[PDB]
Q: What sequence folds into this?
């Protein structure tokens, strides 16, 4: 179960989707460092820009 707002590329690269630009953010192939950032990004989805 991957975290919400976060997705993965067919190459196995993790990427987060910002709701203000709707664009994606390249993190890396490490679900450890990627999920880490996604979590901080998830906290902002509750505080808003």
A:
């Amino acid at each position: 179960d991957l975290p919400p707002n976060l997705y993965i590329r067919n190459n196995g690269y993790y990427c987060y989707r910002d709701p203000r630009t709707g664009k994606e953010f390249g993190l890396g192939r490490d679900r450890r460092i990627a999920i880490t950032e996604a979590i901080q990004a998830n906290i902002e989805l509750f505080s808003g820009h």
In short: The chain has one domain: 1-49. Residues 1-49 form a domain with the Double Stranded RNA Binding Domain fold (CATH 3.30.160.60).
